[PDB]
Design a protein around this ligand. Structure first.
Ligand code: MG
Ligand code: MG
Ligand code: MG
Ligand code: MG
Ligand code: MG
Ligand code: MG
Ligand code: MG
Ligand code: MG
Ligand code: MG
Ligand code: MG
Ligand code: MG
Ligand code: MG
Ligand code: MG
Ligand code: MG
Ligand code: MG
Ligand code: MG
Ligand code: MG
Ligand code: MG
Ligand code: MG
Ligand code: MG
Ligand code: MG
Ligand code: MG
Ligand code: MG
Ligand code: MG
Ligand code: MG
Ligand code: MG
Ligand code: MG
Ligand code: MG
Ligand code: MG
Ligand code: MG
Ligand code: MG
Ligand code: MG
Ligand code: MG
Ligand code: MG
Ligand code: MG
Ligand code: MG
Ligand code: MG
Ligand code: MG
Ligand code: MG
Ligand code: MG
Ligand code: MG
Ligand code: MG
Ligand code: MG
Ligand code: MG
Ligand code: MG
Ligand code: MG
Ligand code: MG
Ligand code: MG
Ligand code: MG
Ligand code: MG
Lengths: 111, 64
RNA sequence: AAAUCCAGGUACGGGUGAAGACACCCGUUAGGCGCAACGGGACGGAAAGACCCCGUGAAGCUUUACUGUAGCUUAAUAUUG
RNA sequence: UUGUGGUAGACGAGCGUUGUAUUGGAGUUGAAGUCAAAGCGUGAGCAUUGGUGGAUCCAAUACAAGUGAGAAUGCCGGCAUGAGUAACGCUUGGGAGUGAGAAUCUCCCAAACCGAUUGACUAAGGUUUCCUGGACCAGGGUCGUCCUUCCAGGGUUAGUCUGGACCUAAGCUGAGGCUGAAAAGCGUAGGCGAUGGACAACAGGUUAAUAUUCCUGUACUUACAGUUAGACUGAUGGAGUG
RNA sequence: GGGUAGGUGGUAAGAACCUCAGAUCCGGAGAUUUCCGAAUGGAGCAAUCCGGUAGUUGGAAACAGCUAUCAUUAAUUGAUGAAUAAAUAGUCAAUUAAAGCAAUACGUGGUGAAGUGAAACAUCUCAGUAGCCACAGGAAAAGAAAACGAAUGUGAUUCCGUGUGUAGUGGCGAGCGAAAGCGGAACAGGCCAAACUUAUCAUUAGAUAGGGGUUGUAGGGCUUGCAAUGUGGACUUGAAAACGAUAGAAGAAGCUGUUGGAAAGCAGCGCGCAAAAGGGUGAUAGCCCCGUAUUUGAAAUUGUUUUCAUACCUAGCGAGAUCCCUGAGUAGCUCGGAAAACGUUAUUUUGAGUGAAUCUGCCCAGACCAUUGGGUAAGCCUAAAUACUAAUUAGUGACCGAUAGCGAAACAGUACCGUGAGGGAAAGGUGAAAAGAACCCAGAGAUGGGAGUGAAAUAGAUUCUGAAACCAUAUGCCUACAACG
């Protein structure tokens, strides 16, 4: 399975942004990146191009979007625990459904 | 080729040594001669064989 | 663009010198820098002289040079009575 | 105390480069590289500081070498000199327009050369160089708004034209076969091979680009089937013509 | 089968979809596989043209779709059949194999130079090398003594060290150079012909198919007995098991502060280890991530080994007879060559000629003869050690780091040169992240100057660092009567 999936809450443990909590919107496995909403906001200088029916307007000024972040800098966020903390996960297989599930190693919380 | 039809023995390549031991490549050819070999009273083909094979056939009562 | 180019700020007369000097010795002359000309010199440029000699170098050709050989011709022997 | 010029040459002692092995040390508070400066050595050489640079490097003792560049009409790359010099490879003037910019682009009027040709149709070859619009990185021996250059789109219509589905010349290939150490060479029957022989379409119009091909008009030729009438049909071979 | 939550190959954003009834992706097994090319229906200027035959569907037929087949040679079989009665040659049909390529590498065989050295050159060397051709194989070749050789000797072949640069061989010059023995790697010996016998061929067999036999301190056959039912193979089919190969699963351990754009650096306090190999993460991370040590797992294909059964082969010691068999144009010999270290010679081989004997036999022990001794030619097959790497997996380097390393880090045998064979380059690095510079000014525009992002824009796509030659600008000094390495 994968350490980080599309949807789970995640934070950053290195860089200028420390303790930045967000939801992963998209994962590129090949480039080992991850788009997390609200984090790594870059503002491309949006030019103007008019060669299509939609390009006739293409209103784009200082649109701030999301820049991808290396998957190593991401860490899963705990929610079930009363005191939330950042830890590592296991890949135990519970015989109830025989499906692999991530479980933290500093607690006993699933996913 | 200049070779027997019963056997496959062909030419022998060697040196032509003379006085002063000068080397020149030469070829010995087999004594190919025409002969007719009967086989069960028929097919008297005019094969081209060497004299050695001809002698062998003669001493074998023309058997091949 | 081009061949050329060791670095140059690159006079003339007599002598000297590897034996014919822009550069050495002794004298004379000459403000700095161009442009248009013509070829005296720079033993000017292009071509590791084709002439000559050397190399126990190459190649082509010639002959009663040597050693061989294709081909031609003669004999023995086998096919062959 | 005696000495210390020196080529060929002999001998001895050292410097420097890269890497490896053992130790220690420096480095985003800035390593290597790289530039500058008014330093230290007997020599190869070695430091200090500052600028640039952005991640490796230094000292000691040993070991192993693709280990030291000024010359080889040395190889490669760059840049000078000659020199803004020679040259720019047969063809004029003006008016109007476009354009930011015009001797060079567009139109018009002349003018000058070709006119058994610089005119027109095609074979061979070339392979999109053809038409339209746009552009002026590069190419055009100048310029350029322009080009046979570049970009985007488009363009080649056949029963009768040129060649196959027809035929052979020189020649090539060539089952068998002959010859030859091997590879192969020769060669019969067959099969290819036009620059030749046989075979039915002419006139006009149309698009920016095709036209005996598309369109209009009028024709022709060869196959197959049905049908009518007449006739016995007569080749893979013989003969004539070709 | 594994494995998930993403995917629709790169220059590549966007548009439109697919995907949790399990996608994309990885592995095993299959399906489809246009045309040229051994090309093989015929041709031909390669990727084109022109067909025949037998089916089937439309048409009224020509015709047009959709299928299969159609080359040559060799072997076997059958049919037909000339000169010429029979019979062959030939013709036709059916079945089975062969064609070709590459691994710039190893093997065998045929053919086979020259540059060069000898300080010239012809013998010789180079060298049986290069090249040309034929045939393979996973290796090939060789191979079980008519042997070495001088002894109370060894007992197939192959490869390594020594013997030794020795004995020798050489215009005795340049040079060339073993065979014994010894020490090692591996080790394996089998099977036909003839005798004798069985059955069948107009049985003129001298031929076909079986039993018997495979030799040297001679063996086998002929006749007559004892002992044998085993051990082992280079061996066929099966069944079972084990070890692997082709995807994978799990896989421990860290926070705080400081410089900094950014920490992983530095410092403090800790923790894990059968994991301190490596890669990435904004600098230099054992504890951030992927991994590594270790434990594991295969539906399907495939490799090695072992066990059981099962085919095939595989068996000793005597006696008598005194009879038979033991590889012929063969061994020798002569005339020309060659192989061996030998420049031809005892041994090996052959183009021409000639030509033996049959265990009281034949060959050999460097001419040759005698004694002694060794061995059984003229028939075949043979694993292992040995030679090499185009390719697949893992890994290493006191090997290279864009003039180096393969010619080729990039789309290189490309661009380009030549009719052709053939010859043959150069060229890598923005930044952690394109956040690739919106906007304003000048300009026709590219572009430049600001602004903005960024730690840095003198990192700006001309994109790491940026040396010298070379070209310009400037502070200071000197230079227009001056003969200048
Ligand atoms: Mg010779
Ligand atoms: Mg004098
Ligand atoms: Mg000379
Ligand atoms: Mg001479
Ligand atoms: Mg000579
Ligand atoms: Mg004669
Ligand atoms: Mg001295
Ligand atoms: Mg060092
Ligand atoms: Mg520095
Ligand atoms: Mg060197
Ligand atoms: Mg020059
Ligand atoms: Mg100049
Ligand atoms: Mg001049
Ligand atoms: Mg002039
Ligand atoms: Mg002029
Ligand atoms: Mg002109
Ligand atoms: Mg003019
Ligand atoms: Mg005129
Ligand atoms: Mg004309
Ligand atoms: Mg073109
Ligand atoms: Mg045009
Ligand atoms: Mg235009
Ligand atoms: Mg121009
Ligand atoms: Mg028509
Ligand atoms: Mg024809
Ligand atoms: Mg013609
Ligand atoms: Mg036209
Ligand atoms: Mg599946
Ligand atoms: Mg010679
Ligand atoms: Mg010589
Ligand atoms: Mg010499
Ligand atoms: Mg073999
Ligand atoms: Mg895992
Ligand atoms: Mg882990
Ligand atoms: Mg690390
Ligand atoms: Mg003898
Ligand atoms: Mg020899
Ligand atoms: Mg005997
Ligand atoms: Mg003797
Ligand atoms: Mg014998
Ligand atoms: Mg290179
Ligand atoms: Mg370079
Ligand atoms: Mg070409
Ligand atoms: Mg700027
Ligand atoms: Mg530059
Ligand atoms: Mg730079
Ligand atoms: Mg003065
Ligand atoms: Mg004066
Ligand atoms: Mg003077
Ligand atoms: Mg002076």
């Amino acid at each position: 399975m994968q350490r980080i999936k599309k949807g789970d809450k995640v934070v950053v443990i290195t860089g200028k942004n420390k303790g930045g909590s967000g939801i992963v919107l998209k994962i590129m496995p090949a480039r080992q990146q991850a788009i997390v909403e609200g984090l790594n906001k870059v503002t491309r200088h949006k030019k103007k191009d008019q060669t299509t029916k939609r390009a006739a307007k293409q209103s784009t000024g200082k649109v701030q979007q999301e820049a991808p972040i290396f998957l190593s800098k991401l860490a899963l966020f705990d929610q079930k625990a009363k005191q939330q903390t950042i830890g590592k996960i296991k890949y135990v297989m519970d015989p109830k459904t025989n499906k692999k599930t991530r479980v933290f190693k500093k607690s006993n919380n699933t996913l | 080729a200049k070779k027997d039809q019963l056997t496959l023995r062909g030419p022998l390549y060697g040196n032509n040594r003379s006085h002063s031991k000068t080397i020149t490549r030469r070829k010995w050819n087999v004594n190919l001669q025409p002969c007719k070999v009967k086989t069960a009273d028929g097919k008297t083909t005019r094969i081209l064989v060497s004299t050695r094979t001809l002698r062998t056939l003669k001493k074998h009562n023309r058997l091949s």
